[PDB]
Design a protein around this ligand. Sequence first.
Ligand SMILES: Nc1nc2c(ncn2[C@@H]2O[C@H](COP(=O)(O)OP(=O)(O)OP(=O)(O)O)[C@@H](O)[C@H]2O)c(=O)[nH]1
Ligand SMILES: Nc1nc2c(ncn2[C@@H]2O[C@H](COP(=O)(O)OP(=O)(O)OP(=O)(O)O)[C@@H](O)[C@H]2O)c(=O)[nH]1
Ligand SMILES: COc1ccc(/N=N/c2cc(OC)c(OC)c(OC)c2)cc1O
Ligand SMILES: [Ca+2]
Ligand SMILES: [Mg+2]
Ligand SMILES: [Mg+2]
Lengths: 426, 436, 155
Amino acid sequence: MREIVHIQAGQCGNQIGAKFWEVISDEHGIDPTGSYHGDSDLQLERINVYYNEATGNKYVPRAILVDLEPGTMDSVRSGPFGQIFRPDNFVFGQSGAGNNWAKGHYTEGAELVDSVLDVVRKESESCDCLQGFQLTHSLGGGTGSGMGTLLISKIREEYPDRIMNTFSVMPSPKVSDTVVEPYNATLSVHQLVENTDETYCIDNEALYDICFRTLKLTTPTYGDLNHLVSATMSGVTTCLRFPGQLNADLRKLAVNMVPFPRLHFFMPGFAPLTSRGSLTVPELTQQMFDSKNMMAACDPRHGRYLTVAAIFRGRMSMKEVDEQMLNVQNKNSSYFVEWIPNNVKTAVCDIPPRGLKMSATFIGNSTAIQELFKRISEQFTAMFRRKAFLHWYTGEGMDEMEFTEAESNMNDLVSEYQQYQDATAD
Amino acid sequence: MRECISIHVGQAGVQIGNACWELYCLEHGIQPDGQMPSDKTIGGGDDSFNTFFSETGAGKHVPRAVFVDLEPTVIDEVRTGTYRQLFHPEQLITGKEDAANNYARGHYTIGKEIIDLVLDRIRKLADQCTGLQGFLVFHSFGGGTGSGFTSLLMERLSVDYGKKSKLEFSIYPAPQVSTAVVEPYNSILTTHTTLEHSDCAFMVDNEAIYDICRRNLDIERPTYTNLNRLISQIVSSITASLRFDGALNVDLTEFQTNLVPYPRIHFPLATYAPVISAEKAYHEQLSVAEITNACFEPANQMVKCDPRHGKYMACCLLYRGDVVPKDVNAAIATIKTKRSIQFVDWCPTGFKVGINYQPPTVVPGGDLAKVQRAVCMLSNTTAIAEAWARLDHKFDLMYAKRAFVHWYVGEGMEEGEFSEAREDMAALEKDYEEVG
Amino acid sequence: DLGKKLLEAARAGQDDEVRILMANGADVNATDASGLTPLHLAATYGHLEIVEVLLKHGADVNAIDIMGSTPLHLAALIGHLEIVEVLLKHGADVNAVDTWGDTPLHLAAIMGHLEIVEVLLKHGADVNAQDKFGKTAFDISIDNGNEDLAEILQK
Ligand SMILES: Nc1nc2c(ncn2[C@@H]2O[C@H](COP(=O)(O)OP(=O)(O)OP(=O)(O)O)[C@@H](O)[C@H]2O)c(=O)[nH]1
Ligand SMILES: Nc1nc2c(ncn2[C@@H]2O[C@H](COP(=O)(O)OP(=O)(O)OP(=O)(O)O)[C@@H](O)[C@H]2O)c(=O)[nH]1
Ligand SMILES: COc1ccc(/N=N/c2cc(OC)c(OC)c(OC)c2)cc1O
Ligand SMILES: [Ca+2]
Ligand SMILES: [Mg+2]
Ligand SMILES: [Mg+2]
């Protein structure tokens, strides 16, 4: 269990994806030219999980960059780490998908799908022992959502015994008021429930709410929202990238975090929350469990934790962390299911992120996530009831029964979360 | 002289293995390259240490041991550490992908890719034996490899070496230092499938060892290094009768005769005393009476349970050091005038005694102080049923909801195996209740 | 039939075609199979100029389709602010109720069009109007944890 093949699809997928490579390259001592300038031998110990070793001891990201819109490739290259990507790993079409899930999944997206798979095969066969895949995408557009899910199902057919993990960005009218986004997101959730092993739910609603109410930015931008996303992606991948006592991989996280196959949607969290260009263990434990630090717009105190994983980064007493973790499970006991014993796992990493002396990253599988699913469901139903813009989808080959089926699956998912929230250990 | 082969499976079995063979080398006077200057017979011999070590024509003493793991990072440390030259490199076997804390992967899908290589390498060790008595198997209950691979291995050893004894040293999970939420599942699955293939099994409760490291050794947050050093001292005291001259537990068969009255209730409790911190170099020396009494204190037990709540079916006292036999007799006589020692009416109320007159060895860099006398008590008490009930309850909380079961079913295991394994544990708890 | 052509012209945003069809006798109040009129389609697809042209030529501002949707319900759902204001200026029933018990306020609230919510509130939208499941727009904002919407509805 070593290498990860990362794929980034569509505009949101590529922008969050680029920020991820920039942030983790900095932590690992890697520069935009691909050379290692780090001071700690702990930065190269598990460097092969995300980087390919190349001639001249150059480190190339095992990343594949995909979009139906061509202009995206130009924005990726013009970034700070733009030239670090493999020039052959860019698969870009000519005609975008204009927020149409059907275009991404059935017509324009399906034409460029065998091309992406050729690049996936090449990176996968060059791996000593492939762990699985990591996809970054939004669910509200057409390419990341429609083509992204198609790519997932295709990869799942070729590599069934490997883990499929996604960083999926959920829509909010607060960031984008494009009324077809609940359609696109609901169609994609229907695919994600079946075809991924683990999904990090990154909600634009929560990101906006943090920037506006906690960080006091009255006009938040994509840059501002992506600053919370990059810190979250850095934190949740800490244990895949740094040695530690645990030899963590994507499959060990799945076995331990996911008790029922469909309930694989995680609510990530981060502390401390900070803005661009601008702490003790008890405070960090508290903040990490506060609804205002969650990356999904759900109150954890409205549901119950099935499983939790927490990563404390920086220099600190491991005994103090053990003490505070047990303390948070005592006073907040009614928020953990009593039928999954020892369901909170903690790791400590010596290397902290950029700009922070200490940090904590939370990964929760909570029944409170049903709030996020109900919000999108209510919007999908308001639109679907009036059959608004339905022809934009059915004209691409889609059957109206696919909408009915997607809505039916997402409501079944909410009922399943509610079922385990009300279950007792008797 | 009858040979014993040790098999170390998965991370816990391997790390505990490393710490035991280091200690065995120190007790017998074997150097890290295998040289032993106190052995006059070069290139062979029938001495008691020969049960655990073979000899080459060059005077090299090699452990009769196999290390196996489904991933290579733990065994690679053995390949490059202090005792890298002690083991034959073909004796250290590694796969590429581990069992991901899943019994079904270790037993059915990943475990099948390496089972024949392991068995053929064990046969090479067995072929060099004149009178193989059997195997000592080290493994965790909680890991995917320690649970699933160990059971597949125990099944195959029962077919290929039918008349040979099989003894386990098993690590029982603790919440304080565990890896996976599904460790209770792995623990019940491996217990059910190994029960008929094992003659005697010494369980080491990680919570008991953790508590002793904190209370007796003043170690704030014990690591696996501190736990394994204490475990290897106890495993050394249990195996000393196999590697040195003596009159008690001299062969694998005798561990069954002395400690196992009935085939299924084969889980003896070990108690060890005294455990003193190395920072107390000038400690007062405890008498034979004090260390003997310490064996009846629940705090010094390797498995958390209360023997006052149960009945004894056997009791063996293994002493090491400056121990006068009449002092053992006097300490036992005093201990017999006590209401907390109740034997089952169908077993003689006797205590079997064995004394090795060499003091225990401590490893350089360890946490224990040197002592002039130590004792390990091995007893079969129905109070160990408390350990089984704690694990069965954790299994039941999850299993009622079928939480995590899809991971097992997706790796070639039927859901019916979980209920058959739980029914066997219910029967095992009733076996202890029937004895008393 | 110029009515079927006017329906298609209003949806597609063909301004000159609407003017021609009306001059030739097209039914400004023609309906499709589901009862949608050229004004419903113009309001849904955001053709502001076609909405104003149709209202100056006898279109019923409060026409309902088979599901009870008025043009104001569709303009509030889709988020067309300029059109919502034009429809109210021309007599649209701010509190019209569809077959699901929704008023334009319930639809602007669900879809998060906060500016349209403020406009509806200023024109007399009823905060106590309940949908078929008994929810008001204020209940929707509480149940979804939309603090921004709850503040506006508490004005
Ligand atoms: N957090 C965040 N959300 C983004 C970003 N870019 C777009 N989004 C969101 O993603 C959704 C739109 O999806 P996009 O990724 O732009 O669309 P696409 O996948 O490129 O598809 P088409 O352009 O329609 O073919 C909306 O909800 C946006 O708010 C970004 O960089 N950060
Ligand atoms: N005492 C002790 N316990 C250990 C050690 N290593 C792991 N454990 C325990 O063993 C259990 C986990 O099993 P491991 O042996 O690590 O797993 P494995 O057998 O390698 O199996 P997989 O990694 O799942 O393939 C947990 O209960 C740990 O606390 C060790 O060196 N000493
Ligand atoms: C609730 O019980 C469990 C939860 C998860 C467990 N470990 N899986 C991982 C946990 C991670 O963070 C600590 C992690 O960093 C994100 C990771 O990297 C891949 C794996 C094990 C558990 O016993
Ligand atoms: Ca010899
Ligand atoms: Mg785009
Ligand atoms: Mg392992």
